[PDB]
Symmetry: C2
Subunit: 459 residues, 2 copies
């Protein structure tokens, strides 16, 4: 029945299962959230800023508990889980400190009358999030919308129900009124019904193309505004003038952070010929020195994939890639464990007709391509159905900026791998989705820009 | 087969029919538009500003021809058709003069590195427009996107194929490269297929809830960003301190402009008790003095509805409303004509349980409600599934601004009826849709805010 279950990927053992709610429980949740939305309409955003700061403090206070729950449910290295909490504390403080200020009415220049638009709330938002960054994905949507005054109903990934519940509890106890963030374990059908309720006025999703399509289709059918933060197959472009040290530092985790289970992981490493062998050698150095083990242990640098099912899907993708012509430049040694460990692998010679060429590969799989010049790098970078993030490594900044501009993608980091922060917009184009989260753009995602114009003079 | 046909609502006679394109013609159009999108990526927005100004001039040059075609296809008073052309000339000049400037890169304040985001094009946009403002609906989307560099494929309403073709021709001949705006007569199935093509990266629609749902559902399924400009059932709030003269001037066309076939028509006139009888009297004065006739003739002030089918649907809505309890305070005399004329009517006593209470009525039908005070006005105004525009008539501006803020809608005009201009955002909430057209917001609808951050310092 319910697919919501906590299964430790390191021991491959389940430790908790959760049921789908009843129709009554769902209605009660929507009722509470909608009631809160109405109440918030009469309370300034600044009035919630203090509470958001307290939430930031509560997250810090529960950092080790939150990190452990994450690591237990989806295998992330504890160190990375803690970094995620720190990032979330920062995001909460960011919106607590800058949100209300960015919601002040905006004056419009018009000779038609005295005009301006207010930035108002819209209603309850149905947030659907993935298992890869269980806290950050939630906070990315919660923080700004809490300030705006949009209550959130959360449907988290089926495999992080414990982290989802814990997050919601901490936030409520920190001071967020009941209804601010309600965690629910709905079936796909229940989710569809919730989206069809008139009290729901926004749909935000981060996840897979498959899940995205279904949810976005439902939002559309019901004419609800939506934001889609999907996967990516980011081009990591290494120019011939890349600084050897910068390149080395970045390759340390450009593809292996969170075991490569990152939408902005540097999946397609595009190297200009003179640096091809150099990049391959460095990747092999990085990969070969990883250490598999309990993600809760400090010496572990290679965690298991989030689930045995995820490991198996990856094995299938890689096999299909190899059977189509991809070559194995390197593969980590066999790992003796009942855990969902996948061996870091470096693939080369992936042709345009290879099934994996335009497919997002979630896992520790470096995909290296060799190109002749800048134009070829850009052409290959854009020969993609995706467009989330990207990177350009080169010492000549002017050159790097010029190349960056030509990449059809939502974000580009010069001399660094993926990055995220409260002040920076996050989002993509094409199959990677639409809309932006974080920064002022994400803050306005579900805001009603209410135009008010006094035209008394002309009537 | 094809539903695309020109039928004069005044004579109720068809004068032209158009076929759906072949698969080959559709592919050729998408190919041309996509090719143009790629070429434009290397040409600054300013390079298209001159052409947009020339387009503005061409529209002015063809004003009488364009106005006549509109009036012949959907019955609008020629004077209103000309006003629409003037509005479009203004919008084109607006984006030609302010578009490129609003597309300059935006610097972001971050200690993480030197950050900024570019405002880039995204691709071909599938624009679906309605018959009520045949030129304005097209220009509203074309102007800003032309500057941005997003080619447009247009699917106009089945009943304005001649106006659609003429508009596209004038724009091309004015200087817009082939592919900038291609008019097509696709069937619903062909439309769905176009939306599923990877070269299409945005879907913009203005029209009905029915059409919107289907198109928005398809956009979602295909994960394409979309904007929905749907109907409204705007609250026209008359406060007890409304200036008698302002009120009179505004009621002259608050409900009868374009025969009430306006999404922002003042459909729900909510009057505080002390001014109830006054408003009813004025509406009767306005309605009774209208003159039915050929919309091409200067003395005609009451045009026919856009189609016989539209007239019949309205008769059915009104009958249902009356059979449920709505009362006829006034009804224009019978009109002897084979044309699609509907008699202006004033309805009162529409209860919450009346089928028409929360239904958009396109036509010359004033719906008057009486309320006790400001709170009751706001409560009734928000007791709606819609939220496009609104109006608040009152001499005390501070009071009017306070009431305006409490209305759950996208725009509110103080002491005036609906308004639109290049610098003003147009859009709603709830069933009225999402996203905004015109102003800087509409300009960014299908823009890729491409974040670029140089983090060399930290690596």
């Amino acid at each position: 029945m319910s697919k919501y279950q906590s299964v430790n990927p390191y021991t491959n053992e389940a430790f908790a299962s959760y049921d789908n709610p009843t129709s009554k429980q769902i209605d009660e949740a929507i009722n509470l959230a909608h009631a809160l939305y109405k109440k918030w309409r009469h309370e300034e955003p600044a009035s919630r800023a203090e509470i958001l700061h307290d939430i930031a403090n509560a997250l810090k206070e529960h950092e080790d508990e939150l990190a452990k729950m994450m690591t237990l449910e989806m295998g992330k290295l504890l160190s990375e889980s803690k970094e995620e909490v720190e990032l979330c504390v920062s995001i909460c403080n960011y919106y607590a400190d800058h949100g209300p200020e960015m919601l002040k009415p905006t004056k419009l220049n018009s000779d038609l009358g005295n005009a301006y638009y207010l930035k108002q709330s819209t209603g309850v938002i149905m947030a659907c999030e993935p298992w890869n960054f269980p806290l950050y994905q939630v906070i990315r949507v919660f923080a700004p919308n809490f300030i705006v005054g949009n209550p959130i109903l959360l449907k988290h990934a089926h495999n992080v129900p414990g982290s989802a519940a814990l997050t919601a509890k901490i936030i409520k106890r920190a001071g967020a009124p009941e209804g601010s963030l309600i965690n629910l374990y709905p079936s796909y059908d229940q989710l569809a019904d919730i989206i069809a309720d008139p009290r729901i006025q926004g749909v935000a999703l981060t996840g897979s193309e498959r899940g995205g399509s279904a949810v976005a289709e439902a939002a559309g059918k019901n004419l609800k505004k939506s934001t889609m933060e999907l996967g990516g197959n980011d081009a990591f472009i290494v120019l011939d003038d890349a600084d050897p040290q910068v390149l080395r530092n970045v390759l340390n985790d450009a593809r292996t952070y969170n075991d490569g289970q990152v939408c902005t992981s540097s999946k397609r490493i595009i190297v200009e010929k003179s640096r091809y062998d150099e990049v391959l050698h460095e990747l092999k150095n990085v990969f070969s020195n990883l250490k598999a083990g309990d993600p809760l242990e400090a010496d572990t640098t290679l965690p298991p994939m989030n689930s045995e099912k995820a490991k198996e899907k990856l094995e299938a993708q890689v096999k299909e890639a190899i059977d189509a012509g991809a070559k194995v430049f390197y593969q980590y040694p066999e790992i003796d464990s009942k855990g969902a460990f996948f061996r870091p692998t470096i693939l080369t010679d992936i042709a345009k007709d290879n099934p994996v060429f335009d497919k997002e590969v979630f896992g520790p799989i470096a995909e290296v391509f060799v190109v002749e010049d800048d134009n070829a790098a850009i052409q290959l970078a854009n020969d993609s159905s995706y467009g989330l993030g990207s990177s350009v490594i080169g010492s000549d900044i002017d050159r790097a900026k010029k190349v960056s501009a030509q990449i059809e993608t939502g974000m580009t980091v010069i001399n660094g791998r993926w990055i995220t922060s409260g002040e920076l917009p996050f989002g993509g184009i094409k199959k990677s989705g639409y809309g932006r989260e974080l920064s002022g753009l994400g803050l306005m995602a579900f805001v009603n820009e209410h135009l008010v114009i006094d035209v008394t003079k002309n009537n």
